[PDB]
Enzyme design. Structure first.
Site: not given
Lengths: 160, 92
Positions: A80, A87-89, A120
């Site tokens: 992530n 940052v994929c949050l 993802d």
């Protein structure tokens, strides 16, 4: 500004109501600027135990309507987070709601180190290795955290 | 509109924090107080975050006007007690 912006009122509220885990520490370079600060996460369990990860927060005037901007300043091998620091949050982008707080984001960030999400991810390779080979991933994390290469990619040391 | 609060110019910060901590019409757990000074935001005091409390503690001990704090100026106070940040119209 003449008075406090809507954003400044809210951020003051949120920042004052943080209930962070022992693994997280927040810091402000300037006590008067609550729109810019660092978060340090030193996991004590999970694949990243013993590591130290620094994130920067930048709260915009559109907050809480607009989610704040967060980036990882510590190179890390993670599904992530990419080499560039993105940052994929979920709650940081499409799942953001004005009702969420900095405390919300912080818990989201720390969860990424407890349960990396192969779905993802920003680093697909890291993702694959996570689902395909649970342990190889574990080794890659260890090596990269100590400072080392994975493929032709060098990951700088980040142990606490 | 801001709840008109009246303190004497000589008062110290600890004083305002105590009013907020003990008022039966308020008594907030751990209030964070800020104000706009010279067009910028100035965090007077906040205990919840150590990074900040450590550099704002001297203010509790400082005089009210030694804070460049002048009257009619709305204070911004946030606490667990407050659903939203509330503004206090300081009184000279």
């Amino acid at each position: 500004g003449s008075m406090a912006s809507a954003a400044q009122l809210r951020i003051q509220k949120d920042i004052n109501e943080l209930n962070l885990p022992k693994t997280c520490d927040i810091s402000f370079s300037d006590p008067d600027d609550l729109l810019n600060f660092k978060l340090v996460i030193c996991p004590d369990e999970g694949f990243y135990k013993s590591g130290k990860f620094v994130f920067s927060f930048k709260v915009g005037q559109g907050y809480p309507h607009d989610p704040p901007k967060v980036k990882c300043e510590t190179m890390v091998y993670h599904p992530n987070i990419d080499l560039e620091g993105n940052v994929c949050l979920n709650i940081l982008r499409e799942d953001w709601k004005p009702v969420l707080t900095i405390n919300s984001i912080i818990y989201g960030l720390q969860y990424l180190f407890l349960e990396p999400n192969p779905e993802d991810p920003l680093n697909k390779e890291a993702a694959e290795v996570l689902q395909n080979n649970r342990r190889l991933f574990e080794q890659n994390v260890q090596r990269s955290m100590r400072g080392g290469y994975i493929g032709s990619t060098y990951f700088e040391r980040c142990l606490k | 509109l801001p709840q008109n609060i009246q303190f004497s110019p000589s008062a110290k910060l600890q004083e305002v924090l105590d009013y907020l901590t003990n008022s039966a019409s308020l008594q907030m757990k751990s209030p964070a107080i800020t104000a706009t000074l010279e067009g910028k935001n100035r965090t007077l005091y906040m205990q919840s975050v150590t990074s900040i409390e450590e550099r704002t503690r001297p203010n509790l001990s400082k005089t009210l006007k030694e804070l460049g704090l002048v009257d009619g100026q709305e204070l911004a106070v946030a606490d667990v007690t407050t659903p939203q940040t509330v503004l206090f119209k300081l009184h000279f």
